[PDB]
């Protein structure tokens, strides 16, 4: 059975990996469920604020959680993230006015920052082997991909069959189960300050080899962050595609991302992580360049797959290298070196929906896509400098 199997066994770090994966999955599912439901100082500032609130608050919160992780430990931030996510879901399930609908999203951002930073730091801390660290972060990063893949269908099946608040009243039970698992694994009631003080954030931010790794992730995710909302508008404007085609047009970019994140986590150590990131940046740039040449959805099928695959490669390559570099040239404390990675992640999702729309209004969708692709292509050779960073310790 399952009671006896868990009752009589040596608990492994795979339980920690499962906890991190589940937290990321639930956070991204909560993120993607609300977007189909949000439309329901007049629809110009309000909608943009609602979309950017969680990403902005997460980006602001990340450094504080990074320092607090060193100050007190990982399990307390992980449990706090679970609690804040549950409260945010319950607040979403009942609030109707705009102010509470914005407070809930900000709270979700805070909880997501706690969970992401603490989970990545703990995964780095317990898995100090390069190969194993790469594998486990590749597995854990698939949580975001699966969450964004299963979000909208999960929201839409219950938004009409049961009711308006059914998706949230169902996600709350999943969050509670995740909290129960965390209680079974961790001890969130004891402060465990880390043995050695980590390097200051400013010292890490002056590292040339860490800025390149962060910029790779930032510029890779920004492309898809701008492309996701701007694609349907151009699709309706040009190909007069129906309402059902808009949802399925972006399916390959998520399926391929889910596949690539899982496979390249283990495939990016046999060949160089620098080479994996270089090739991923080049591929995503070429695909984004080729997107605006599609006269119908069949043309859009393949570039989206390329974009998702390449973003998966660059993410799975640049997650372990953040942490490998801090082991190599700094103090082995991963609390505040993954706050930077999470900030790079969240910058795209905070900036894209507004800046991409403004640029598409100004010059157009093809020119915006060309700019994004050219930037991604030109940033690619900068990943060669991570081939052999000097130890210098």
């Amino acid at each position, epitope marked *: 059975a399952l009671v006896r199997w868990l009752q*009589e066994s*040596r608990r*492994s770090r795979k339980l*920690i990996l499962f906890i991190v994966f589940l937290a990321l999955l639930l956070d991204n599912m909560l993120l993607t469920v609300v977007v189909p439901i949000i439309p329901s100082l007049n629809e110009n500032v309000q909608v943009g604020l609602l979309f950017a609130s969680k990403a902005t608050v997460q980006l602001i919160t990340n450094p504080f959680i990074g320092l607090l992780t060193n100050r007190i430990g990982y*399990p307390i931030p992980i449990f706090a993230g679970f609690c804040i996510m549950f409260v945010s879901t319950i607040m979403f399930a009942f609030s109707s006015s705009y102010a509470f609908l914005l407070i809930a999203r900000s709270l979700q951002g805070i909880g997501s920052s706690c969970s992401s930073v603490a989970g990545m730091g703990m995964l780095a801390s*317990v898995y*100090t082997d390069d190969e*194993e660290r790469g594998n486990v972060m590749g597995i854990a990063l698939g949580g975001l991909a699966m969450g964004v893949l299963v979000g909208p269908p999960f929201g839409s099946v219950l938004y009409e069959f049961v009711g308006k608040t059914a998706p949230f009243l169902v996600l709350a039970a999943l969050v509670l189960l995740d909290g129960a698992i965390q209680l079974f*694994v961790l*001890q969130p009631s004891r402060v465990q300050p880390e043995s050695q003080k980590g390097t200051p954030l400013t010292t890490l931010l002056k590292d040339p080899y860490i800025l390149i790794a962060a910029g790779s992730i930032c510029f890779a995710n920004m492309g898809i962050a701008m492309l996701e909302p701007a694609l349907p508008i151009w699709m309706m404007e040009t190909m007069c595609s129906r309402k059902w085609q808009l949802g399925v047009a972006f399916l390959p970019a998520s399926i391929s991302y889910l596949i690539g994140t899982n496979i390249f986590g283990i495939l990016a150590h046999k060949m160089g992580r620098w080479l994996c990131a270089l090739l991923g940046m080049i591929i995503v740039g070429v695909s984004i360049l080729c997107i605006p040449f599609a006269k119908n959805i069949y043309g859009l099928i393949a570039p989206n797959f390329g974009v998702g695959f390449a973003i998966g490669m660059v993410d799975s390559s640049m997650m372990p290298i953040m942490g490998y570099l801090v082991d190599l040239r700094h103090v082995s404390v991963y609390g505040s070196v993954y706050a930077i990675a999470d900030v790079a992640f969240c910058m795209g999702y905070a900036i894209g929906p507004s800046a991409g729309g403004a640029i598409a209004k100004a010059i157009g969708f093809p020119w915006l896509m060309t700019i994004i692709g050219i930037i991604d292509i030109l940033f690619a050779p900068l990943c060669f400098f991570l081939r052999s960073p000097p130890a210098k310790e």
Partner: antibody
Amino acid sequence: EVKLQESGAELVKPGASVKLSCKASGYTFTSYWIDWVKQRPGQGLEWIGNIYPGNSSTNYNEKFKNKATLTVDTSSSTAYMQLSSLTSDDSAVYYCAREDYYDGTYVYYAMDFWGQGTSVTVSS
Amino acid sequence: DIVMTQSQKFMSTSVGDRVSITCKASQNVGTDVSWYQQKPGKSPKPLIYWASNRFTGVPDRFTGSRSGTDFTLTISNVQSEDLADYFCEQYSSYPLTFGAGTKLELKR
């Protein structure tokens, strides 16, 4: 001051049973697993089994399933291993160890504290 | 049952030298390996947990490495107190299997 106290030596006639003790002090007895291990002279260590003093949930090596029975006594905070139908092969040194968790978590990383051995000899 | 093979039962060294003890797994035990040291007349104590991490209070001489299914324990500056028995354990799957001993002895 975690301490696992074990009897110095035991003498048992062939075709008989013995019960080895491990008295645990200095910590909460019911919160950590207890491992029983065997070392023959000039041979490698063999893992006999595992027990949890809380719910008395045991893990047995299939080689030692019919030989060793692990029990606990939480009132006196002691762990017993009973070996039945002993023969000259069973003459070895038996160790009692405690499993430790990583900080803040419940995952196992090492067996920090080992009790001293018990030299069991089978002769007549 | 994974068999952790330790090739050498006896190793002869001298004070100040560097020594390495190898332990080879059988079925891809992934970093679920610990190293224990038993001094003459004492009970075993852990040195390396998770195949690379040093236990608290262990001197900086002892290092742990893994290359696939081979695990190495390295003592950089062998001293008089480092002459003892060393063995490897894996807990990847029950039954738990220990590697055979390896004794460090002086040279003359």
